[PDB]
């Protein structure tokens, strides 16, 4: 019999082979292989206005990542060069064009339509298939997973969107109008179509179609699709006597329309009101063609299949009206499909290619009209070659990927890649987001559905409004890629199902759906699903095909589409798992791989649909006869950061969530390239350590090669009250010996811009002549070329790169790049590069030492967070009777009401591991039990309770109670007080409001909002309110005439105030006011609003 260790040996091979970012790489590879060709075939060809001239598209291929230098050469490009030079890692797309003249094709001409960004480490990238040494020579970390783009030198990652499954019917309840609605989102060539059939209180079926202003009666639009005879609708809707009765009632209520022409004219009147006779008919036909179920086929021949699908939808609606079937919950992951990188990229490419072909036809038509026929037809090759502008496509792609605003209203599709440490990056690469608006509650959407088990991490989720709408994939997840649909359709047809049009769905027969569209009927659904399962397990067909049957409604569902989330499971046959001991031995020896197990019928992937028919056994010893599958490793249901917490089942859920979220903020050696990388911010921990108590997963996923914390000696007692309310006390001698000591990097960047007209910037030491020339002491360590010396000391407002700009908005503006006003450090490296445009580009990084101090934030993996409350000399710290001096002291009040027994278990385990000389397994559910740790601690000469006797540091006599002390893994967070302190005395001001600026960088002021105003009113301090609001910001003086109240206009020339509107000078008074109020008066007078001011004397 197998044990969880053998299943672990099997499971680790999955990550050993596939990796952790396969959902990006596989989708992008499929896109490159076939999506470009599919889109090109979809567009077809160019149709200009030139007589007897046509262009037919051929094949499209992608070159290698290259860069067009400002100088004529074209050279290979590597990712590090793109990062340093602010380039864009991309490859040119070559498309062949066949010219058709007088219905005759010629020799195709190869043209360059633009450049397409390359996802790193894909099958087309340069880093694919390289060894570790080659990657190191190229300047990259071998542990880097790839799967992200580089746009203008910044790393952009595409987060997967979670959309409703397409071309599927979902029936919902609308109790406000008492309408029972079914909705389908039909997809064809990137266009979406929300088609709904609904039944109101009257029992009449109405159909909603896009671009149709009002719902139309069901049988009206059904007749408009041909199929005019009432018996045809009666048959299509089904063969249930109540259903036939309701359909006949609808027919009686809609006997006005009996001819397809009548219905077409009717929809013409609705969709095109008040227009010509011929226009409305064509508009109605067009709307019917490309707005009613486009996925079924836009060709006018396809009316019959669309009518059949509409009848199926109406049947579902009326069946739910009778309570036969219940409402379908949208959160069920059978109804949700993830939008991977490839799908979104294909949509964007199609959008840009439309503009490209439009520009091509415009340019060709314009050139032919301007010139003569001889000039064009003499050399058609040169004409086509010179009638193309690739920048139209390239700039669209680049800007869409850079800003993140997809064409179609989507925003935030691509986000800047996080690089704080290993966990943060790898977790960002595995994120799933929902398109719903965050402001609304969305109580049902944010909850944890039962189908998320094994597909979505239950703990890792944001804290704020994003709680429940942003989720991360579980460790044992496998997103699918699509397969040729027609081949699956042919195989199913050959299996024995009769086509749909031959016979109607007699309730004695089983409906069969392929990717949500009905395709035929069968008699024995169970035999069919068993046959398909056997073929799938043998290896006859692909492993992406999933089959599920529903006994109650007699339906069979076959899924082969893109974006389903699946998990692996061991197949159980007759109560015996198919994975035997010798298979585990073969996997261990390397003779067998995970893919071989998949192809051998031992392990099969299950999506949310097929899992409906499963009955999974959790543990190997619990397998009984009725079980059909066995769980591989229950500890893998957690996300990547959530696996960091040891003994996570001993903690309260909110604390586990906090710890998982905080594991992405700790400092540490995230990547080996930190020395030569150029990121805006970065941290490095001087002495990282592997956790003593760790889960076995992070050794496999590679975390232990890039640790992000240290092992502290923690004692739990109250000390002087300086550790109260989640504050910690840290030893001083330990800090002075290199504990939690870190370094902070920040990269500044300057560019020698080349303005139009020849006036360019230059790097130099600014002479005192120039305007804006700051103090001489600021440029004190710059070399004569205008660049700072490496390993020099800067302290704030010091110039790093001296640069003077042309006076064009006999002088020279000073535009040097200086350190941030509140920062400090030492210059680490200076890089001189030539940017993409041919000008110069300089990047400087300043490193700063950050010894721990008061206010610095520390946190454990179990959710306990705090700031350093006091630093204590070593001689004042207590010491145990065995000679141990605590590194850090926590408050005993933080343990209860936080309920984190896992922290105490880890505290015991750390000291047990340190005494025993071996690390301790702390896996989620198979880790070392607590009782074993306590017994081992007892065997080593310590108390089983983990408590010890200490002596007080000051008095020197032992404390009355014995104290708990152990070793716990603590992480230093990047919220450090040196980056949060901010002060403002006078500072600069804004332009429009003249209030203090906003932000620490520009010496901004803090915000005194409305709530503070109400607080100050509640205290009853009027003059304090005046002082805080008006006196220190926007003081003003204004003259006003005493009969109109219009703002009197002073005359500096005549030294006399007067009313321009009123012509008054007898009485003008001077009034104090705020600048904001004056601007509000001006803005009211901008409209026709006239505010008349009445003055009074105090």
């Amino acid at each position: 019999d197998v044990t969880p260790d053998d299943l672990w040996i099997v499971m680790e091979s999955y990550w050993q082979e596939k990796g952790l970012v396969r959902q990006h790489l596989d989708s992008y590879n499929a896109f490159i292989e076939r999506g470009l060709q599919e889109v090109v075939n979809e567009f077809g060809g160019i149709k200009p206005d030139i007589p007897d001239f046509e262009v037919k598209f051929g094949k499209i291929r992608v070159g290698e990542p290259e860069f067009q230098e400002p100088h004529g050469q074209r050279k290979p490009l590597y990712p590090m060069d793109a990062r340093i030079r602010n380039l864009t890692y991309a490859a040119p797309l070559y498309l062949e064009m066949i010219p058709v003249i007088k219905g005759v094709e010629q020799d195709p001409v190869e043209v360059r339509i633009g450049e397409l960004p390359i996802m790193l480490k894909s099958k087309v990238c340069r880093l694919y298939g390289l060894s570790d040494e080659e990657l190191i020579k190229l300047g990259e970390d071998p542990k880097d997973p790839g799967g992200y783009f580089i746009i203008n030198g910044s790393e952009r990652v595409i987060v997967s969107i979670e959309d409703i499954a397409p071309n599927r019917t979902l029936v919902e309840k609308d109790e406000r109008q008492e309408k029972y609605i079914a909705k389908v989102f039909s997809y064809r060539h990137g266009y979406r179509a929300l088609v709904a059939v609904e039944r109101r209180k009257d029992g009449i079926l109405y159909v909603d179609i896009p671009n149709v202003p009002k719902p139309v009666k069901f049988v009206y639009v059904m007749r408009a699709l041909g199929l005019e005879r009432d018996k045809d609708i009666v048959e299509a809707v089904g063969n249930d006597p109540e259903v036939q009765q309701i359909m006949f009632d609808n027919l009686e209520d809609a006997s006005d329309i009996t001819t397809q022409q009548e219905a077409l004219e009717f929809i013409g009147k609705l969709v095109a009101p008040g227009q010509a006779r011929e226009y409305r008919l064509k508009r109605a036909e067009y709307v019917i063609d490309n707005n009613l179920l486009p996925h079924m086929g836009v060709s006018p021949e396809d009316r019959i299949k669309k009518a059949y699908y509409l009848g199926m939808m109406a049947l579902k609606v009326i069946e739910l009206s009778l309570g036969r079937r219940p409402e379908d919950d949208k959160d069920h992951y059978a109804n949700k499909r993830l939008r991977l990188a490839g799908d979104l990229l294909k949509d964007l490419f199609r959008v840009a290619f439309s503009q490209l072909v439009k520009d091509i036809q415009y340019q060709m038509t314009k050139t032919y009209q301007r010139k003569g026929d001889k000039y064009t037809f003499g050399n058609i090759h040169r004409f086509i070659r010179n009638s193309i502008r690739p920048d139209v496509l390239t700039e669209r792609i680049e800007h869409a990927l850079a800003t993140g605003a997809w064409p179609g209203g989507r925003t935030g599709v691509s986000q800047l890649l996080d690089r704080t440490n290993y966990m943060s990056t790898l977790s960002h690469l595995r994120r799933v987001t929902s398109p719903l608006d965050r402001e609304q509650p969305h109580f049902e959407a944010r909850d944890l559905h039962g189908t998320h088990w094994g597909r979505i991490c239950p703990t890792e989720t944001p804290e704020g409004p994003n709680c429940g709408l942003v989720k991360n994939l579980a460790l044992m997840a496998q997103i699918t890629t699509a397969v040729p649909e027609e081949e699956i359709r042919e195989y199913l047809m050959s299996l024995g199902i009769v086509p749909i049009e031959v016979r109607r769905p007699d309730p004695t027969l089983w409906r069969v759906y392929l990717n949500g569209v009905l395709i035929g009927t069968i008699e024995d659904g169970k035999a069919l699903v068993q046959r398909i399962r056997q073929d799938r397990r043998s290896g006859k067909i692909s492993d992406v095909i999933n089959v599920a049957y529903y006994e109650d409604v007699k339906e069979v569902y076959v899924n082969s589409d893109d974006g389903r989330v699946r998990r692996p499971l061991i197949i159980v046959e007759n109560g015996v798992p198919k994975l035997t001991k010798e298979h585990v031995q073969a996997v261990k020896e390397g003779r067998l791989k995970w893919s071989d197990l998949i192809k051998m019928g031992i392990i099969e992937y299950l999506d949310a649909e097929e899992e409906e028919n499963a009955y999974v056994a959790m543990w190997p010893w619990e397998v009984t006869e009725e079980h059909t599958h066995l769980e591989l490793m229950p500890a893998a249901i957690l996300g990547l950061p959530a696996s960091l917490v040891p003994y996570p089942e001993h903690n309260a859920a909110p604390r586990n969530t906090y710890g998982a979220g905080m594991a992405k903020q700790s400092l540490g050696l995230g990547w080996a390239n930190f020395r030569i990388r150029v990121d805006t911010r970065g941290h490095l921990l001087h002495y990282p350590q592997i956790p003593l108590v760790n889960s076995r997963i992070m050794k496999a996923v590679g975390y232990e090669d890039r640790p992000a914390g240290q092992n502290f000696v923690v004692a739990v007692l109250a000390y002087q009250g300086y550790n109260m309310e989640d504050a910690i006390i840290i030893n001083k001698a330990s800090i002075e010996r290199g504990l939690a000591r870190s370094t902070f990097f920040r990269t500044y960047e300057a560019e020698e811009k080349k303005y139009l007209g020849g006036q360019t910037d230059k790097f130099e030491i600014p002479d005192p002549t120039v305007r804006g020339y700051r103090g001489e002491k600021y440029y004190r360590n710059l070399d004569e070329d205008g660049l700072i010396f490496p390993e020099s000391k800067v302290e704030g407002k010091d110039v790093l790169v001296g640069r003077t700009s042309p006076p064009r908005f006999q002088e020279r503006r000073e535009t040097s790049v200086a350190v941030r006003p509140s920062e400090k450090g030492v210059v680490d490296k200076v890089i001189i590069t030539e940017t993409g445009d041919g000008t110069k580009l300089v990047k400087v990084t300043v490193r700063d030492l950050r010894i721990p101090e008061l206010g610095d934030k520390f946190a454990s993996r179990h959710g306990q967070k705090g700031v350093i409350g006091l630093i204590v000399p070593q001689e004042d710290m207590p010491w145990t009777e065995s000679g141990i001096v605590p590194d850090l002291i926590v408050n005993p009040h933080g343990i209860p009401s936080r309920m984190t027994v896992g922290q105490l278990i880890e505290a015991i385990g750390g000291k047990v591991a340190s005494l025993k000389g071996r690390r301790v397994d702390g896996t989620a559910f198979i880790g070392e039990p607590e009782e074993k740790l306590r017994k081992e601690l007892e065997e080593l000469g310590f108390k089983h309770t983990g408590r010890e006797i200490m002596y007080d540091g000051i008095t020197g006599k032992r404390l009355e109670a014995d104290i708990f002390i152990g070793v716990i893994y603590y992480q230093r967070l990047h919220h450090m007080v040196a980056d949060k302190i901010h002060a403002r005395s006078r500072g600069p001001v804004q332009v429009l409001t003249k209030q203090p600026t906003e932000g620490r960088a520009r010496e901004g002021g803090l915000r005194f909002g409305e709530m503070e105003r109400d607080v100050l009113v509640g205290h009853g301090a009027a003059m304090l309110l005046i002082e805080r609001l008006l006196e220190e910001s926007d003081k003003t003086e204004v003259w006003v005439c005493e009969n109109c109240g219009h703002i009197a206009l002073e005359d500096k020339r005549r030294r006399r105030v007067y009313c321009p509107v009123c012509g008054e000078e007898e009485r003008i008074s001077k009034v104090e006011m705020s600048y904001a109020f004056k601007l509000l008066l001006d803005e009211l007078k901008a409209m026709v609003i006239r505010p008349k001011l009445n003055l009074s004397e105090r």
Partner: protein, 901 residues
């Protein structure tokens, strides 16, 4: 000699007023020329002002800052309809007549409406009701009473379009599209006598003015231009819209002069009207918003005023302020509760202007001599004339010598200065308080720990803001009204808020528990540490072995109390009511029982203090806690805020010393139950599961009796939940029974220092039942939450009941159920914060400006009497005795004990 704005009268503008107000007519649709030099007559004309440095305007001249900005105007070729007054225009048109322009009302009806409209015209709602009634009566008419003409019905379209159905042949009533010119002619003929009946005054709102002829141009300062990276000089969206208007109406004038076919004139008229509509309101319904180059709608005047970031709120209501700082907070119990530790770096930057007088000339002179780099120094010096100088090492001595009476010095912060300390969000009044300054070396704000409950702050990364008032009146108000010790009693319930938390309560219990005794050195050290000015130790209570004196904790605590204090009550630690009953009988028999008898019948659970001596009891949360600190409340009510401050500052330090030097810890064995308790818990859980299964079987057989609950399934779920809740309660009861008071966690839970019994029973016995929105976990697959259970299973475990504890570990299914449980709490807090915030904003805007007058009444701003005596009693809730008007029993007992003693 200055005047103040006493009142504002809003009105509509007039074309003549627009013409007189403006100083230039903008005809050229150009913004800027080469190298600046704004085009004369352009949208950036220097006549309206100057924004950039180096140029002067013409109307008033001066620098860019000196110029306030001046208005322009644009004379439109043909009138257009204002968006804001569109509905009013429609109502006027469909109410008044077309020929004489008079309202379609009879003379006697006009007279009666005149009589009622003046009567009680103050209230707005009744005024609008009368206006609507008049409008309806006017609309229902067909023929005008004054002239026999058919008033054809008029229709309105959302994008300010009017096309009435003018009479057509055979009465077809063709919908003639009304033009703004004929609408203007209609409105001008309306008389002024009946204008009030239309809700319009005859002075500042003329119906003719309601249609635009000339519109103004905001000053250049009002529409600033910000230079981009390459000197794009990207101007405000208002400038772009104005350029569009100027170009469009220029071409309209050209084709008007040319006499082109009037269809093109109408099309240009519609384009100009749409452009003006977008300028007035870019979001106005019925029109397509005008986006910029990057597809972003322009922020015109209407959107500029409205919104969170709009002008009205977020720009005058709140703004960025000077003399403020923000940094993280760290605890410090060694300072008084009315002090804040300020980093020395912040003190060097923030300054307080001080006027040089006779009694502070020496200190100010010395601090000026210190310069701006040593700490007790200054930054700027203001001479009596008004000019401001900067302190530098070159002119330190000269400036120090020139200092005299009348000068102003911008000194650094000093010990004893008053500042404002705030934490966001500011839910209640106590979110901002005034603390005295105490300078500290490091870089974080230090706040006394007893002051946490008001700010609701924890030292886990929170940040707080500090404000420094600059004027003497502001400083006096902060010092007198917002001192920390003045806000010890909460105004929400009349009880203390600034009290002990956590270690204070726990150390109090440890100090005054029964059996606690302290040696000579411990007593002296803790008394000195607390700060008590004792000089001789009291007589020893008990002599231990080896002849060493020992002092009970009660004596040490009683050294901190006032001399004349008598109070008795029951605290949370009471478990044997018989002892408290006997003690109460002894006290009630005669109000001053002999102390020795009380010591004989002492019991932790009945705190009794007699003339400042703690005779029996243990310090609990009821002593000086955050919510029900009886002793703190009594002291602060009977002696004063200063005495309460001293008492708090002493007890906090004493309790901290006790808990620090006695030792206090929690460990893994704090939940180690003996075997008998575990067996009992397993038996309880098994019995509960069996009962649930029996209920399920009874439901399946159909024998279940429907409760008043409508659905049988709901009855089953309610019964199951009740059974499971009772099971968890019984398990908690036995777990609490088997853990004594020697356990530190039990001590922390019972005294109220931290946590509650629920945490203990969840870490020791079992988590219990997980639920969402008050129902068992049901979302998931069809008929089952997880695929690991059979469909149709309703058992306890299958729906969320977790039979394990945090100490014993959870199985994976229980882990998933618990995560599903916790997600609900997370999202609940996330939504609750926003809902509560919106409610509080509405309440504040509703009740902002009510106040108590000098006669005791509460009056609305206009003068309405809301209450004839505040709170029906006239007593401030803050000064009330826990909501009571006056505590009679306490006063009687206090007086009786005082005189008879």
């Amino acid at each position: 000699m200055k005047k103040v704005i006493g009142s504002i009268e809003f009105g509509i503008l007039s074309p003549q007023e627009i013409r007189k107000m403006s100083a230039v007519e903008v005809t050229v649709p150009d913004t800027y020329d080469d190298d600046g030099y704004p085009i004369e007559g352009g949208v950036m004309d220097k006549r309206m002002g100057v924004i950039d440095p180096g140029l002067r305007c013409e109307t008033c001249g001066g620098r860019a800052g000196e110029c306030p900005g001046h208005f322009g105007h644009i004379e439109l070729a043909r009138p257009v309809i204002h968006v804001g007054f569109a509905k009013t225009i429609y109502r006027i048109l469909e109410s008044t007549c077309r020929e004489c322009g008079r309202i379609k009302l009879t003379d006697e009806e006009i007279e009666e409406y005149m009589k009622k409209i003046e009567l009680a015209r103050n209230r707005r709602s009744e005024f609008n009701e009368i206006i609507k009634e008049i409008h309806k009566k006017a609309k229902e008419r067909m023929v005008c009473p004054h002239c026999g003409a058919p008033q054809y019905p008029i229709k309105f379209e959302k994008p300010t379009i009017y096309w009435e159905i003018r009479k057509d042949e055979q009465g077809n009533e063709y919908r003639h599209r009304l033009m703004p010119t004929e609408v203007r002619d209609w409105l001008e003929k309306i008389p002024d006598k009946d204008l009030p009946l239309l809700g319009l005054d005859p002075e500042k709102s003329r119906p003719e003015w309601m249609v635009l002829t000339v519109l103004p141009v905001p000053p250049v300062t009002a529409r600033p231009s910000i230079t981009l990276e390459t000197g794009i000089r990207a101007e405000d969206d208002l400038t772009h819209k104005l350029v569009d208007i100027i170009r469009i109406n220029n071409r309209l004038k050209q084709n008007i002069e040319a006499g082109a076919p009037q269809l093109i004139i109408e099309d240009l008229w519609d384009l100009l009207q749409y452009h003006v509509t977008t300028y007035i309101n870019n979001e106005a319904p019925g029109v397509p918003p005008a986006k910029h180059k990057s597809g972003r709608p322009l922020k015109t005047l209407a959107q500029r005023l409205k919104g969170k970031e709009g002008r009205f709120r977020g720009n005058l209501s709140g703004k960025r302020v000077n003399f403020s700082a923000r940094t993280v907070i760290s605890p410090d119990p060694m300072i008084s509760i009315n002090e804040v530790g300020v980093p020395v770096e912040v003190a060097m930057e923030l300054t307080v202007p001080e006027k040089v007088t006779e009694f502070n000339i020496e200190r100010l002179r010395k601090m000026v001599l210190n310069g701006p780099d040593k700490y007790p120094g200054a930054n700027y010096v203001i001479d009596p004339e008004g000019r401001r100088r900067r302190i530098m090492d070159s002119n330190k001595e000269t400036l120090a010598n020139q200092l005299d009476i009348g000068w102003t010095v911008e000194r650094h912060l000093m010990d004893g200065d008053i500042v404002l300390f705030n934490r966001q969000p500011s839910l209640h009044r106590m979110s901002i308080m005034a603390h005295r300054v105490r300078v500290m070396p490091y870089r974080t704000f230090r706040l006394n720990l007893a002051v946490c409950p008001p700010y609701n702050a924890d030292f886990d990364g929170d940040e707080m803001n500090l404000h420094v008032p600059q004027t003497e009146e502001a400083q006096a108000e902060a010092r007198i009204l917002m001192e920390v010790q003045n806000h010890i009693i909460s105004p929400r319930y009349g009880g203390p808020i600034i009290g002990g938390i956590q270690d204070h309560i726990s150390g109090g219990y440890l100090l005054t528990r029964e059996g606690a005794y302290f040696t000579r050195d411990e007593v002296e050290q803790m008394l000195m540490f607390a700060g008590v000015d004792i000089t001789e130790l009291p007589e020893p209570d008990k002599y231990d072995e080896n002849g060493n004196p020992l002092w009970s904790g009660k004596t040490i605590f009683s050294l901190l109390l006032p001399e004349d204090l008598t109070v008795w009550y029951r605290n949370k630690l009471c478990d044997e009511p018989e002892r408290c009953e006997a003690l109460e009988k002894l006290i009630e028999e005669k109000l001053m029982p002999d102390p020795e008898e009380v010591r004989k019948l002492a019991y932790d659970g009945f705190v009794y203090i007699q003339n400042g001596k703690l005779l029996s009891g243990a310090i609990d949360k009821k002593a000086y806690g955050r919510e029900d600190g009886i002793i703190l409340d009594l002291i602060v009510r009977e002696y004063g805020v200063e005495r309460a401050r001293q008492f708090l500052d002493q007890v906090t330090k004493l309790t901290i010393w006790v808990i620090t030097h006695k030792g206090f810890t929690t460990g893994i064995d704090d939940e180690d139950l003996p075997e008998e308790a575990r067996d009992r818990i397993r038996e309880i859980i098994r019995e509960a599961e069996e009962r649930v299964n029996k209920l399920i079987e009874a439901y399946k057989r159909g024998e279940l009796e429907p409760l008043p609950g409508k659905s049988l399934e709901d009855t089953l779920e309610s019964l199951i939940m009740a059974v499971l809740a009772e099971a968890r309660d019984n398990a908690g009861a036995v777990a609490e029974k088997y853990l004594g008071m020697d356990n530190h966690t039990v001590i922390m839970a019972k005294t109220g220092a931290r946590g509650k019994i629920l945490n203990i029973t969840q870490m020791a016995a079992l988590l219990g039942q997980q639920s969402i929105r008050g129902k068992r976990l049901y979302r998931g697959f069809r008929g089952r939450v997880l695929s690991h259970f059979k469909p149709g299973d309703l058992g306890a475990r299958a729906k969320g009941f977790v039979v394990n504890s945090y100490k014993s570990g959870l199985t994976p299914q229980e882990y998933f159920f618990h995560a599903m449980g916790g997600r609900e709490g997370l999202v609940d807090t996330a939504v609750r914060t926003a809902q509560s915030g919106y409610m509080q904003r509405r309440l504040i805007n509703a009740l902002q400006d009510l106040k108590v007058e000098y006669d005791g009444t509460v009056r609305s701003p206009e003068g309405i009497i809301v209450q004839f005596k505040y709170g029906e009693d006239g007593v401030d809730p803050m000064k009330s005795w826990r909501g009571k008007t006056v505590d009679v029993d306490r006063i009687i007992v206090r007086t009786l004990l005082k005189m008879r003693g």
